[PDB]
Amino acid sequence: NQAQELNHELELEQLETKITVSSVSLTGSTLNVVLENNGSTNLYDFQGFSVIVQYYANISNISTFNLSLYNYTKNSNPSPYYWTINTPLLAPGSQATLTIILPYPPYPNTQATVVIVTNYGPSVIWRGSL
Amino acid sequence: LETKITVSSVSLTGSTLNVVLENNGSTNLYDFQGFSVIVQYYANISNISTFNLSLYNYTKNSNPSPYYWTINTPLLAPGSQATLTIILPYPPYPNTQATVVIVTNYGPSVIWRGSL
Numbered sequence: 001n002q003a004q005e006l007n008h009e010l011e012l013e014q015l016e017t018k019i020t021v022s023s024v025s026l027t028g029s030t031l032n033v034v035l036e037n038n039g040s041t042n043l044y045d046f047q048g049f050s051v052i053v054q055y056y057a058n059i060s061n062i063s064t065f066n067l068s069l070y071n072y073t074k075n076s077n078p079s080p081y082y083w084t085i086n087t088p089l090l091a092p093g094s095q096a097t098l099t100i101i102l103p104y105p106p107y108p109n110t111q112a113t114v115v116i117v118t119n120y121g122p123s124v125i126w127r128g129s130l
Numbered sequence: 131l132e133t134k135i136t137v138s139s140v141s142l143t144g145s146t147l148n149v150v151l152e153n154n155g156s157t158n159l160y161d162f163q164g165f166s167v168i169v170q171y172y173a174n175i176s177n178i179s180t181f182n183l184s185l186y187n188y189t190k191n192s193n194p195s196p197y198y199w200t201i202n203t204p205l206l207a208p209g210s211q212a213t214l215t216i217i218l219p220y221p222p223y224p225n226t227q228a229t230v231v232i233v234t235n236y237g238p239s240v241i242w243r244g245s246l
């Protein structure tokens with residue numbers, strides 16, 4: 001293929017950004033995601049990230065599909081439907097912990113999907129058991 | 131200024147999912163490469179109904195490849211509608227749950243929940 005053209009449509013930073021999920025752990029209704037920066041861009045514009053979680057919620061004892069978007073906050077103890085991260089800047093070759101506050105504890109033995117989209121475009125999907 | 135989008139209709143033929151979006155906000159929407167599009171559905175993979183949740187990438191091509199989406203306007207202005215078309219990797223298994231998530235470049239989003 002032809003080399004990609006860098007112009008008004010495509011920024012090098014899109015090609016240079018890469019995140020992976022090292023681990024996901026659940027405590028109560030709190031998801032702690034260890035996010036790793038495997039690219040060469042600094043990540044700091046967290047308000048510009050998108051975070052989606054799909055899971056099965058325990059709503060009054062009923063296992064109920066839930067898919068929601070989560071909004072960023074600098075607050076270290078977020079409300080439900082909010083997430084935060086324990087660093088002001090996630091540099092290449094480092095990890096940070098992204099904390100997502102779910103509206104309900106997950107129903108046990110169900111699968112969940114976490115989607116994290118950087119402000120630059122590139123993203124990561126994690127699917128698994130909690 | 132506020133950004134707001136709503137789903138007017140959802141329609142399906144084969145693996146082609148058409149979402150008619152209305153701009154009910156004050157902002158003009160045009161930075162489609164900066165949108166995020168996520169679909170959860172049940173794919174028919176060799177007659178097997180299979181959970182699928184994937185992210186879809188933007189293209190200007192009016193006939194996108196699987197895992198791509200496009201929209202049939204250069205700009206979605208307040209008060210107007212346009213069709214966001216998503217090309218799924220498999221035809222949906224009949225009469226199954228789906229969730230469509232469209233995130234604008236500004237942040238605000240819309241989620242459609244139904245069946246295919």
Ligand code: NA
Nearest residue numbers: 179224225226
């Ligand atoms: Na079925």
